């Protein structure tokens, strides 16, 4: 087995957020896309795509899902807040669930000079020891 390798999603429209949770799909821009279809073809099926979603201004992460398939490049159009967004991926969400960029803000990630993984970009790639330390937090984030 391999062990997973987790993402950065990055939304500046919280109705795709729960557009992606009721059906369980996504799509990121063309670099993206292609970023993520990368890491899901090289993975094989031996282990997880991990995807860690925050919406743009809200000060906190808002849950994760795990990548279900390829990227399909050719689609439905004009099915997200914009037709900017085109292609599509299955995703599985795991838990929704809002946990502060607070608890989060001292993890920071050796691949994007050391930045604060609160501070990352769409589909940031976490290293995975960073990640296992935000997904531990996540999962036990009390309110
Ligand atoms: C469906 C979708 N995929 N990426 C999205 C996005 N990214 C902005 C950079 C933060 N904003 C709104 N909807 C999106």
């Known amino acids: 087995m391999k062990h997973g390798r987790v993402f950065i999603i990055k939304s500046y429209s919280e109705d795709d957020i729960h557009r992606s ?11 993206g896309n ?5 890491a899901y ?6 282990g997880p795509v991990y995807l860690l979603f925050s919406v743009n201004g ?9 990548m279900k398939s390829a990227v399909d490049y050719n689609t439905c159009a004009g099915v997200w807040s914009q037709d900017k967004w085109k292609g ?7 838990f929704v669930k809002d946990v502060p960029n607070s608890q989060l803000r001292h993890i920071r990630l050796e691949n994007n000079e050391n930045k604060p993984v609160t501070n ?6 976490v290293p995975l020891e960073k990640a296992k330390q935000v997904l531990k937090i996540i999962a036990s984030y009390k309110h």
């Open 21 to 31: 949770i009721k059906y369980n799909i996504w799509c990121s821009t063309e670099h």
């Open 120 to 125: 990352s970009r769409d589909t940031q790639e």
């Open 88 to 94: 599509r991926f299955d995703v599985r969400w795991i």
């Open 34 to 38: 292609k970023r993520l279809d990368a």
């Open 58 to 66: 809200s000060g906190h992460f808002c849950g994760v899902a795990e």
């Open 41 to 46: 073809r090289s993975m094989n099926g031996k």
